[PDB]
Amino acid sequence: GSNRPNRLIVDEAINEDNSVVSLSQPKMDELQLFRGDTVLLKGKKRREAVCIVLSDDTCSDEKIRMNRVVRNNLRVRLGDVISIQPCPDVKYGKRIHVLPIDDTVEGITGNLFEVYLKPYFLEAYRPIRKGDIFLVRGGMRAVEFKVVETDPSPYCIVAPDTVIHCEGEPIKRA
Template identity: 55%
Template sequence: MADNKLIASDVASIEHADDSSVVFLSQEKMEELHLYRGDAVLLKGKNDKEAVCIVLSGEQCMVHKVYLNNVVRQNLGVNFDDEVSVSFIDVQYGQAIHVLPFSDTLEGFNGDLFDGFLKPFFLNAYRPVTKGNTFLVHEGMKTVEFKVMETNPSPYCIVAPETMIYCDGDPLIRQDNGGEVDMSNLVG
């Protein structure tokens, strides 16, 4: 197995396990890959699916594993014990991103998506996003799932305080074919 090919493992026992912008490695593996706490890493899973996350070290992490949550696993198309490549990537701050919510996660919510979910999620967090990936935002008793429709620069960037966040357009409707999205309802 190549040095940067690691085994996907469950992050549930690690603090910040629900944050889909973070993955964890052992300190030994971070040193081996010349990574530092807070570096952006490009993760590659099955069928060339990619995600960019921030890397942190965990004391309980094993050297041959990458610890990621279910959202990151789904974005990469991997299961636990599948191989994931991890490498440093220099990611630019985004000028703008466009995200849309999934309609089934909006049930009972009638407020402003930006103020209610996106602004608190991204505020001073410097979160990486990848075009085509999804992420969950937990606010109060509600969780809304969003999909990254576009990033500038593309295909990934870091959402900084200056990044414009757009969420206009009709919510996405899930299909019954493995979570694929009906793209016909998007505003062009």
């Protein structure tokens, strides 16, 4: 381990991607992180997220850039504090189950896997965690999905062979 303090102040993203957070190069070096590393982010009350880390030359050394989706998963606001640590060797998922949030799919017609999930996950090797809510663009409107279960649990890589389940009743917004 690097032995160094691993708390960072939450800052906004420049490129919106649900799976990425960004640090300065000095901070990456302090924490022995490489670009594309899987990292585990922690907030309070056991809230967690798995992301990939990238290096951004405009990010302040004591901050972490993360989008609104990741911030909501961690239950933080801009300016709140999280921790970041290595999460090596995240296993490839056998299967995951996601369900849409009801108010994001009300009235929609069309196959949610083809329009939303397949292009989102295809050949992207996204890390994901049980309990995540993630926003996907497609069609006419953006859809939010909750990760109901993963196998392995609670997190995995959504790899080419990972089976994607999305049958069931849409979930109420919490």
